Design a protein around this ligand. Structure first.
Ligand SMILES: NC(=O)C1=CN([C@@H]2O[C@H](COP(=O)(O)OP(=O)(O)OC[C@H]3O[C@@H](n4cnc5c(N)ncnc54)[C@H](OP(=O)(O)O)[C@@H]3O)[C@@H](O)[C@H]2O)C=C[C@@H]1C(=O)c1ccncc1
Ligand SMILES: NC(=O)C1=CN([C@@H]2O[C@H](COP(=O)(O)OP(=O)(O)OC[C@H]3O[C@@H](n4cnc5c(N)ncnc54)[C@H](OP(=O)(O)O)[C@@H]3O)[C@@H](O)[C@H]2O)C=C[C@@H]1C(=O)c1ccncc1
Ligand SMILES: NC(=O)C1=CN([C@@H]2O[C@H](COP(=O)(O)OP(=O)(O)OC[C@H]3O[C@@H](n4cnc5c(N)ncnc54)[C@H](OP(=O)(O)O)[C@@H]3O)[C@@H](O)[C@H]2O)C=C[C@@H]1C(=O)c1ccncc1
Ligand SMILES: NC(=O)C1=CN([C@@H]2O[C@H](COP(=O)(O)OP(=O)(O)OC[C@H]3O[C@@H](n4cnc5c(N)ncnc54)[C@H](OP(=O)(O)O)[C@@H]3O)[C@@H](O)[C@H]2O)C=C[C@@H]1C(=O)c1ccncc1
Lengths: 267, 267, 267, 267
């Protein structure tokens, strides 16, 4: 039981192939008691989350919604019972309009689209942290989902910029979480065949974008000194759990790369 | 004449202690023919720029204004004469509301303020590039002003996040500028006593923020193996010119640190 | 039992305050079966290791000795019984002569001293890996001890250069270990009061070096968003175990920072 | 005249396609007065250097030779005349035995070979700096040749480790050079078809190594947002001159990438 009797909030589930779905599964397998947040299609998320090895309360959270955020702590302690706190929080949320990643030239994304992408993808990590730290235990852990934005890449465009912003927000959240005895870190994952990701390689964001994404994926397994399996999200789920646990107690403001080692190799 | 007969657009002048003012001075000293852009207080900027060693046309540019951006190329070629192009472009523009840097806790900046800061500070680098590349010569150079956001720092808060976003935008602008034979790079400067910067250390953004900024400055000269003089912007002006020149012809998507070497030293 | 029934070789124990001593303790607490290697003072190491919560075979290993290395795999399988393999290997060995760190100006270390330091500190990670991979199980883990050498620092001098070399050797060991299903990673620790470290702050390597080391230590806890306790090596021991476990299965060629988050913060 | 009346020592010329040959040519084209150092085949180097646009004294320097180093300052001031100092120093020297790069598995390089490689490739930067700083002017510049070792790469093996060591040595040389008003920096170049480099792609270090090097080269021009021409060393020569000049006066302990921007792009 890596996570025995820890209370952990997990966001961002939308299908059975969401990274957050696998994080939640492995975390329960490891003894965690979960609270889940969902966006928009709540009856759908309910139905999907019913397949986790245990039951967990579902709460609505639109990360762009001030009221959702203001009432969040209240609604969580209500779901976990008064006088209980969280030990962990998982941010697994990402969004960039059409316009900002894919077929569209980089120069043609209007700022409103880019601003929305950054709001949901980078800023919400801070506002989740702000809403949840008052109800977190010493020794607690905040983990967010990242990918390595340190070099530019085709197709991902403004989404990459959003991750650069996220990494930076993470170092600041760490300063705040520290006052609570709480850690803040990101997991940088390699590419994973979620529903949306597979749609994009199928050409949902245009044919040039699809081809480039596919090249990025093939290259990944080659560079990774231990290989990369894009259809298996469990290696990244385990990494997040490692961070939710007591076994990385001196790591914060930081990034753990669950990417097969690909980023450490040129080719 | 490092910049002999180069045509260079320089933005962001607001006083005689603006980094852009010194960039513009040194660039003219080096034979450049300049076009200048100003924001908001145009009669003021006119008056300040009159003190440059040579005269240069002033054009209004509010980086958040679509019409300003759409007409920019037209207005520049008009100022430099039909059939002439630019060889260089300097982005020296930065903004973050009150709310996002200083006394305000990091968690208390509303996204609208952060979004405005990012719009002006990071996104505008791309939209300047988009508006100006059609009128840039092969061998040309785009340079933007940066500071090292790779570690978190007190007081700068959301402005730091904005620079992380900027560095990332720069790597993408480089992909686009490359198609024109144009380079894109950032200069990461150490702290400089501009008017605004001195106001902030005087306590304009609160007393805690002021004290922290001052500590950051004193530390800078100590770490810098060659020292740092915060009241002298000419070392950074020279660095930008180095980048506008033909002497860094294989550098792009990159960051040159005009910071005294401070970032290469722990203490 | 994080490490239940894993067989792990641990090197570098010399006193009850060695990082390797604490790694070994926590690993046994977590169900690991250990084999230990010692250098030079073998009766001493025997006596110290007798205090671990369980017994473990001790083997002599002078990392500079070809015969020691050539016979190592033979001697390990002999200690763990034919047909058994290792699941983990810990490199916790460091050395730099007098000459290369401390009072001595950086320019005054002769290459023979620097070469010895690099041999023991960086190269031996590769030669340990070479000697032990033939007897390692798929899913296995090699972990070495590091400190962040990415910026220069007073006093550590050539030892810092040695760590830069080590980080680089680690990325290459990862390519080799990968063929065996084995991971290779480094843990970058903050400063720890080992016997040798305390001697140096007591002025063993001169008074200027001592003063600088002490300043480095005080700064550490201040920058660390979760604090740093230099007299407690257990947070780093736990981190190494995290890496020896199955919970970071997609991390290799990489560095995990068990440093309180200090490296992610400027001040 | 970028380098008008500067006195610059340039090392590492061996043929008309050496990077140092092109550095020396461009530097003279730019008004520099040069002193040259050569290793081993002195009559050969004499003959090659006769083709530079101006004449320059040749001095023997075996970077591994203590007597050569001890007498170096004496012999330089003798060549440039008493009461004159150097303004610049170029380290353009690299070596790794057979054994440490190429066909040989990474694990099969004996430490003596690796130690020699590191001695010549990394350590000599410090010992050149030590020998020459006493005869350098305030405002002076030390520049060494580098390639980006931050990720592992096939074939280069121990040579990559040597560059990691070099980058680290550079940050320490910067601390020492600073006391003299002198800068220390590295230029990280993309691959260049020197005589030795072409021999290696011809299969001098075995067929697997040759094939991998060739793949590395083709990838380079693709990633570089401005392209890369491996048979043209002048873009890197210009970059070194930029660093020898007064136009990067606040950069030290640092690395300038003359690599086409390749390192800033994933693909
Ligand atoms: N799928 C992947 O391959 C990865 C996901 N991640 C991150 O992990 C997280 C998991 O993403 P996932 O792929 O599972 O799903 P998602 O679609 O990004 O996010 C889940 C939900 O969050 C949802 N969401 C959107 N807006 C909001 C909102 N306002 N509030 C709350 N949730 C929201 C979003 O809305 P939807 O598309 O359904 O309309 C989804 O419902 C995201 O942060 C990803 O950015 C990181 C690396 C990889 C990756 O993209 C990558 C990229 C480049 N190189 C290597 C790896
Ligand atoms: N002053 C400094 O110390 C530095 C400036 N820079 C960058 O260089 C540039 C020069 O800034 P400067 O300090 O000279 O002035 P500024 O106030 O940031 O920008 C100039 C003008 O741009 C203006 N501007 C604002 N909004 C717009 C707009 N919408 N369109 C066009 N211009 C605009 C802005 O508006 P204003 O305050 O007057 O209302 C100013 O008029 C900015 O990018 C800075 O971010 C980078 C490093 C340092 C620095 O902040 C630092 C920080 C931490 N560590 C080390 C160094
Ligand atoms: N003590 C510390 O604070 C740290 C240790 N490490 C690493 O962890 C490891 C643990 O070191 P420790 O401090 O526990 O002991 P050690 O003395 O470095 O090494 C253990 C033994 O290895 C021994 N050893 C030496 N030569 C050999 C040899 N040839 N073969 C096998 N073992 C050898 C060495 O020999 P000895 O001094 O006894 O003569 C020791 O017996 C070493 O790699 C350290 O470099 C990393 C970060 C920190 C650190 O130095 C630091 C520095 C700067 N900033 C932040 C942190
Ligand atoms: N040729 C290249 O493509 C590059 C050279 N450099 C560096 O620039 C410098 C120029 O190297 P060049 O290729 O011109 O020649 P070299 O053979 O490395 O060095 C010149 C001489 O130095 C010489 N030398 C050797 N030992 C000594 C010695 N003991 N004392 C003085 N000089 C010595 C050496 O000896 P030799 O082979 O002739 O026996 C040569 O005579 C070296 O530091 C290179 O490491 C850096 C990046 C690239 C590069 O290798 C690369 C690699 C991977 N990715 C991107 C780029």
């Amino acid at each position: 039981g890596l996570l025995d009797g820890k209370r952990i909030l997990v966001s961002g589930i939308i299908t059975d192939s969401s990274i957050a779905f696998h994080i939640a599964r492995v975390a329960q397998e490891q003894g965690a008691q979960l609270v889940l947040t969902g966006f928009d299609r709540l009856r759908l998320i309910q139905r999907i989350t019913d397949r986790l090895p245990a039951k967990a309360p579902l709460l609505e959270l639109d990360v762009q919604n001030e009221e959702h955020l203001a009432s969040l702590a209240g609604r969580v302690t209500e779901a976990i019972g008064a006088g209980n706190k969280l030990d962990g929080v998982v941010h697994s949320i990402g969004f960039m309009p059409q316009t900002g990643m894919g077929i569209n030239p980089f120069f043609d994304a209007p700022y409103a689209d880019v601003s929305k992408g950054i709001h949901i993808s980078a800023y919400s990590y801070a506002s989740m942290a702000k809403a949840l730290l008052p109800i977190m235990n010493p020794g607690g852990s905040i983990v967010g989902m990242d990918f390595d934005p340190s070099r530019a890449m085709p197709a991902y465009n403004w989404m990459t910029v959003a991750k650069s912003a996220l990494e930076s927000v993470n170092r600041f959240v760490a300063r705040e979480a520290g006052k609570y005895g709480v850690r803040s870190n990101l997991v940088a994952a390699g590419p994973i065949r979620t529903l949306a990701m597979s749609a994009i390689v199928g050409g949902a964001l245009g044919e040039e974008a699809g081809a480039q994404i596919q090249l990025l994926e093939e290259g990944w397994d080659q560079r990774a000194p231990i290989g990369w399996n894009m259809k298996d999200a469990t290696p990244v789920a385990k990494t997040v759990c490692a961070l939710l646990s007591d076994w990385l107690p001196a790591t914060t403001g930081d990034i753990i790369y669950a990417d097969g080692g690909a980023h450490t190799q040129l080719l």
